[PDB]
Swiss-Prot record:
This is Uncharacterized protein YciH. Belongs to the SUI1 family. Keywords: Protein biosynthesis, Translation regulation. GO terms for molecular function: ribosomal small subunit binding; translation initiation factor activity. GO terms for biological process: formation of translation preinitiation complex; regulation of translation; translation reinitiation. Disulfide bonds: none annotated.
C-alpha cells in the first residue's frame, strides 16, 4: 500500500571535510518527482537540481531526510555501514 520508496545516501570521504547527498529511487510519476526535489530545494539551504531521477543535494542532513520522507508516509532505506 504505497508504491514508491525513497532512499537517501551520503558518500562522504572521511570524518568531516566534504559530504555529498544523492537522492534516487523515488518510484513516482515523473512530474511528481520534480515536485519532491522542488520542495526540498524550497527551504533546505541551497536549491538542489534534478537529473533524470537523480537529484543532487549538497548537505549532510540525512537525519532531516528521514523526517521529510516519513512526512509522506512512504518507505525509506536509510543506507549505512561500518568502514
Amino acid at each position: 500500500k504505497g508504491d514508491g520508496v525513497v532512499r537517501i545516501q551520503r558518500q562522504t570521504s572521511g570524518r568531516k571535510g566534504k559530504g555529498v547527498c544523492l537522492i534516487t529511487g523515488v518510484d513516482l510519476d515523473d512530474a511528481e518527482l520534480t515536485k519532491l526535489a522542488a520542495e526540498l530545494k524550497k527551504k533546505c539551504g541551497c536549491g538542489g537540481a534534478v537529473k533524470d531521477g537523480v537529484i543532487e543535494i549538497q548537505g549532510d542532513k540525512r537525519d532531516l531526510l528521514k523526517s521529510l520522507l516519513e512526512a509522506k508516509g512512504m518507505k525509506v532505506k536509510l543506507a549505512g555501514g561500518l568502514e
